[PDB]
Amino acid sequence: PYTVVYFPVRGRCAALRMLLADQGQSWKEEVVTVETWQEGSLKASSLYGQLPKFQDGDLTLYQSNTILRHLGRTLGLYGKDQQEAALVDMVNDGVEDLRCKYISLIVTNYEAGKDDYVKALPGQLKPFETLLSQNQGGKTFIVGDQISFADYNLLDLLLIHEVLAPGCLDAFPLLSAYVGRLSARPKLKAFLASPEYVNLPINGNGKQ
Amino acid sequence: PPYTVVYFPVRGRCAALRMLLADQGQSWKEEVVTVETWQEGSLKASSLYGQLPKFQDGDLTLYQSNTILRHLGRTLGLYGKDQQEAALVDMVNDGVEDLRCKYISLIVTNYEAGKDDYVKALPGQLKPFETLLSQNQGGKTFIVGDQISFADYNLLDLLLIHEVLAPGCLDAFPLLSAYVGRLSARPKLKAFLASPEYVNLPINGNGKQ
Numbered sequence: 001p002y003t004v005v006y007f008p009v010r011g012r013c014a015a016l017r018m019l020l021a022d023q024g025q026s027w028k029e030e031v032v033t034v035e036t037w038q039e040g041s042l043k044a045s046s047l048y049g050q051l052p053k054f055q056d057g058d059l060t061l062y063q064s065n066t067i068l069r070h071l072g073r074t075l076g077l078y079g080k081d082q083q084e085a086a087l088v089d090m091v092n093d094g095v096e097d098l099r100c101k102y103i104s105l106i107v108t109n110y111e112a113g114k115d116d117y118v119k120a121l122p123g124q125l126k127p128f129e130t131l132l133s134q135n136q137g138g139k140t141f142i143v144g145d146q147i148s149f150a151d152y153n154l155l156d157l158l159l160i161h162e163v164l165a166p167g168c169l170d171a172f173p174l175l176s177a178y179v180g181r182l183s184a185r186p187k188l189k190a191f192l193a194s195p196e197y198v199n200l201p202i203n204g205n206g207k208q
Numbered sequence: 209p210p211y212t213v214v215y216f217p218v219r220g221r222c223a224a225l226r227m228l229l230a231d232q233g234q235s236w237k238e239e240v241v242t243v244e245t246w247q248e249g250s251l252k253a254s255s256l257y258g259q260l261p262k263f264q265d266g267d268l269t270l271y272q273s274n275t276i277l278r279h280l281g282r283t284l285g286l287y288g289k290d291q292q293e294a295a296l297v298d299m300v301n302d303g304v305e306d307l308r309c310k311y312i313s314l315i316v317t318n319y320e321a322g323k324d325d326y327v328k329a330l331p332g333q334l335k336p337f338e339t340l341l342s343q344n345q346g347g348k349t350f351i352v353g354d355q356i357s358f359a360d361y362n363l364l365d366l367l368l369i370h371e372v373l374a375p376g377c378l379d380a381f382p383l384l385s386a387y388v389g390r391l392s393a394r395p396k397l398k399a400f401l402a403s404p405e406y407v408n409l410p411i412n413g414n415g416k417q
């Protein structure tokens with residue numbers, strides 16, 4: 001029984017929402033506003049004093065990747081053996097690092113920094129193209145035969161990079177087909193077109 | 209195995225995974241990459257994300273220090289008792305990861321202007337681990353469940369390098385303070401923590417700590 005407590009923004013919940021939609025799960029969205037947040041109660045009672053906070057039945061979770069690995073573990077989205085498990089984690093950590101650099105740019109330094117960042121970008125996208133080239137021609141998923149929680153996080157990451165810098169995936173045939181093929185999965189396709197996704201901004205400060 | 213840790217000559221992001229191996233009774237080879245070899249470009253260019261640590265476990269090659277930790281934690285039974293505990297272990301480790309980058313960021317980019325703000329913010333950042341200890345067996349065992357987990361080794365490293373940055377920062381936090389000594393006192397880790405292997409590396413690459 002799933003509840004997502006976050007700001008009215010896609011951000012660090014985009015990926016875990018795509019995961020839930022595509023696994024055909026329901027969930028509730030409890031929305032915290034900037035005004036409510038500044039009141040202090042929820043931040044004070046939260047583990048590390050941030051959001052997302054995620055309820056699953058009796059269990060309360062924080063940290064967006066802790067949620068991904070949790071859903072991935074509980075819904076069978078984590079490779080087939082212990083080695084694919086390691087390789088899933090490798091991809092997701094690599095996604096986390098580029099997502100961090102994306103956030104600092106968006107939040108702290110967008111205007112002066114976008115040019116440098118965009119220059120750097122193909123260098124940062126290369127490894128996921130490489131990894132796809134090494135896993136059955138890139139025709140499948142980022143790791144092994146099956147969908148893993150990393151796929152959802154790398155999909156979100158590519159989507160928001162196509163908005164920040166359109167055409168950045170054009171030099172990368174594998175990543176470029178991948179984004180279209182995953183988006184074409186019918187439970188994701190629907191969600192991705194639903195108002196519950198479409199009607200949120202990507203970040204909180206209006207930049208993208 | 210055989211395990212090989214390829215990295216710079218510093219504790220940095222391999223301190224925790226090293227402690228894990230030592231305490232788990234494992235041996236491994238340290239392949240050292242100097243700043244001068246790194247600037248040549250070859251190893252960088254052939255590395256998945258162009259960074260170190262690289263870690264070989266037999267035929268398997270891994271990157272990303274928390275990938276190493278969850279891999280070792282997974283394969284050596286250091287990941288909690290069921291799925292719920294796996295989530296709590298991940299929650300701890302991610303929390304440890306965020307304060308590690310705030311640490312790294314200060315060290316590397318801004319240590320002089322920044323140490324003062326960082327140090328006042330510190331207790332607020334340390335409290336959650338106190339809180340977590342207080343809710344698991346009065347704080348007397350490990351950060352999650354009845355058994356040691358990869359998260360413990362990463363949290364222990366984090367507390368150590370913070371006693372070096374800011375001596376006495378754990379005086380206000382009884383559970384974390386006892387935890388540091390009790391984990392450091394485990395016989396296979398006591399030994400490693402006293403060995404030249406550990407003692408003769410600096411914490412970071414720029415001479416600050």
Ligand SMILES: N[C@H](CCC(=O)N[C@@H](CS)C(=O)NCC(=O)O)C(=O)O
Nearest residue numbers: 011012049050051052063064065306
């Ligand atoms: N380590 C991150 C933490 C998330 C984070 O940076 N939270 C932000 C928004 S996504 C926040 O709650 N900031 C408001 C504050 O610090 O009060 C995660 O994966 O969940």
Ligand SMILES: N[C@H](CCC(=O)N[C@@H](CS)C(=O)NCC(=O)O)C(=O)O
Nearest residue numbers: 097220221258259260261272273274
């Ligand atoms: N996400 C990190 C990446 C490690 C990292 O930030 N590596 C640094 C040194 S600790 C590096 O290889 N920098 C050299 C460079 O950027 O060329 C991990 O957990 O392994």
Ligand SMILES: C=C(CC)C(=O)c1ccc(OCC(=O)O)c(Cl)c1Cl
Nearest residue numbers: 007009011012034037038202203204
């Ligand atoms: C993750 C983020 C953007 C994708 C982020 O860092 C962030 C921080 C503070 C925020 O507002 C709450 C406040 O009053 O500070 C909001 Cl809405 C966001 Cl989205």
Ligand SMILES: C=C(CC)C(=O)c1ccc(OCC(=O)O)c(Cl)c1Cl
Nearest residue numbers: 216217218220221243246312412413
């Ligand atoms: C681990 C680090 C300090 C916590 C770190 O980020 C780092 C970066 C570059 C480095 O040298 C090679 C070079 O590129 O100069 C070295 Cl030795 C380190 Cl340790």
Ligand SMILES: [Ca+2]
Nearest residue numbers: 026027028029
């Ligand atoms: Ca709903």
Ligand SMILES: [Ca+2]
Nearest residue numbers: 028029030031
């Ligand atoms: Ca709602």
Ligand SMILES: [Ca+2]
Nearest residue numbers: 076077146147
């Ligand atoms: Ca599956």
Ligand SMILES: [Ca+2]
Nearest residue numbers: 169170171176
């Ligand atoms: Ca194209």
Ligand SMILES: [Ca+2]
Nearest residue numbers: 235236237238
């Ligand atoms: Ca050795």
Ligand SMILES: [Ca+2]
Nearest residue numbers: 284285286355
């Ligand atoms: Ca065990």
